[PDB]
């Protein structure tokens, strides 16, 4: 019983640690995708309008 209670608190902290980690990583992904494709767009538009 204590074994599968320690496993339960292991998972009950691991799920929430995974949730805050995916929150941070999702924000990191959104910022990274935003930054990459904005740099892409402004770069290609610089190359296109530089004529």
């Amino acid at each position: 019983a204590s074994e599968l209670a320690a496993r339960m608190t292991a998972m009950s902290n691991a799920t929430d640690n995974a949730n805050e980690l995916k929150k941070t990583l999702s924000i990191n992904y959104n910022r990274a995708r935003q930054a990459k494709i904005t740099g892409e767009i402004l770069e290609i538009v610089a190359g296109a309008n530089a004529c």
Binding site: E40, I44, G47, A48
Partner: protein, 479 residues
């Protein structure tokens, strides 16, 4: 006349002017000649893509920008460039414009096909579907080629693609009695040189007596201008084209790299007054791959089987050049940095690599079940592996704990050594037969050889040799 001036030269882009009497058509070979830094009679060949009004035209040069100076003569040949093709044009290595760069005797230049030509319509395409076995384990199991198809080496950052081409050429050039041709298109020159040395070694070039060489090498340098590199593929393709219609034999193409060609086209298109595109490339990428992968088609007149290396930059797929190259391929082999990191070679993730010629009825409905079972347990392992990396295999439940070790053996078993890669491995490779392959996998996926250690499957050609190495490993576990 047709003699014009070169008004602007910026990189390998050359703005040629002309009197209003003549302004030539596109794709035509132009040759400024007779000048160099040494007063030499050095010529430069340059073809035209965009003609920018006032009887003037911006061209791309297939040799270096040095030498020629603005306000210089230029002699257009009144025609698109023509490549010397023929059985006399086997053996020797030659230029994009066709000049034999083997520095011994030039081939007889009498039959020159134009480098830009029509693509064969599908009424001429041999719709005959066929199967090809090439002796490399994971390929002839899971990505079986079409003897007639188009074959893709989606490679990563210099991992196993060129050595794969060397191995595969070594295994099948002797096999295919028809003509064969390597196109070195922006290939690294010392490894094209090593390939040429291996053709001299294995006698497929037959260095002492040529034109019996069923292989024919044409190469274009990395260090050559992108004006050269954006047509060297067309040169090799036209040699194969001549052999596919005039000779109409079984013809084998091994160009490397097609993405070199793409990058050269992008490279000049930025210069020759054109907009960019999505990341990487020119806006003409799709039509470039259209010209290529519509001209490399096994015809009802004559078969062809073109393999080609595709280096993706950043080792991905969302990249636009492989986003159209997959769409123009039919036998796709996608390599992986991960499987190269674990040494497994060829580092193809079998998940990504597929083929149209993996239909059950056309591979054998038991061979297909072999392929499905391996792809199933393999993909499930590639799913499971991060959960492993956080919760332990010994925790990860048994009905999948068997399959993770099973497919973990599977991939390393289908890592098999090559007769050239022995310089990188230590043991000379093996030419594996597909019956031996499906046999060993019918052991592993079933779970007959679950008793073996996993590293007994490491880098082993045949499953009986894997049992032999397994007995050796057990013996050394005693000793």
């Amino acid at each position: 006349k047709n003699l014009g001036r070169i008004a602007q030269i910026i990189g390998p882009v050359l703005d040629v002017a002309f009197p209003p009497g003549k302004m030539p058509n596109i794709y035509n070979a132009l040759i400024v000649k007779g000048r160099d830094t040494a007063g030499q009679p050095m010529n430069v060949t340059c073809e035209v893509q965009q003609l920018l009004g006032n009887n003037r035209v911006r061209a791309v040069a297939m040799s270096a920008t040095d030498g020629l100076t603005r306000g210089m003569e230029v002699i257009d040949t009144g025609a698109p460039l023509s490549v010397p093709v023929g059985g006399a044009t086997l053996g020797r290595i030659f230029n994009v414009l066709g000049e034999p760069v083997d520095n011994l005797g030039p081939v007889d230049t009498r039959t020159t096909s134009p480098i830009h030509r029509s693509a064969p319509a599908f009424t001429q395409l041999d719709t005959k579907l066929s199967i090809f076995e090439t002796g490399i384990k994971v390929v002839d199991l899971l990505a079986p080629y079409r003897r007639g198809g188009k074959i893709g080496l989606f490679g990563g950052a210099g991992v196993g693609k060129t050595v794969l081409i060397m191995e595969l050429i070594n295994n099948i050039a002797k096999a295919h009695g028809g003509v064969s041709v390597f196109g070195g298109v922006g290939e690294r020159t010392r490894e094209g040189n090593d390939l040429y040395m291996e053709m001299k070694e294995s006698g497929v070039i037959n260095e002492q007596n040529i034109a019996e060489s069923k292989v024919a090498l044409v190469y274009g340098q990395m260090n050559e201008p992108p004006g050269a590199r954006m047509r060297v593929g067309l040169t090799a393709l036209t040699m194969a084209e001549y052999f596919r219609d005039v000779n109409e034999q079984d013809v084998l193409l091994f160009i490397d790299n097609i993405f070199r060609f793409v990058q050269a086209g992008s490279e000049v298109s930025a210069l020759l007054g054109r907009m960019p595109s999505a990341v990487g490339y020119q806006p003409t990428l799709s039509t470039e791959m259209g010209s290529l992968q519509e001209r490399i088609t096994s015809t009802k007149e004559g078969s062809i089987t073109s393999i080609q290396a595709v280096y993706v930059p950043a080792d991905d797929l969302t990249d636009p050049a492989p986003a159209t190259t997959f769409a123009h391929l039919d036998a796709t082999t996608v390599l992986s940095r991960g499987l190269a990191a674990k040494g497994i070679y060829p580092a193809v993730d079998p998940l990504d690599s597929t083929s149209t010629m993996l239909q059950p009825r056309i591979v054998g409905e038991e061979h297909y079940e072999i392929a499905q079972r391996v792809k199933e347990t393999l993909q499930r392992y590639k799913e499971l592996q991060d959960i492993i990396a956080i919760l332990g295999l010994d925790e990860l439940s048994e009905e999948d704990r068997l399959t993770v070790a099973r497919a973990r053996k599977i991939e390393r078993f289908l890592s098999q050594p090559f007769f050239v890669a022995e310089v990188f491995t230590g043991s000379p490779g093996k030419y594996v037969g597909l019956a031996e392959t499906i046999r060993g996998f019918q052991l592993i996926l079933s779970g007959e050889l679950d008793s073996l250690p996993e590293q007994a499957f490491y880098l082993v050609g045949n499953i009986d040799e894997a049992t032999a190495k397994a007995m050796n490993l057990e013996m050394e576990s005693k000793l």
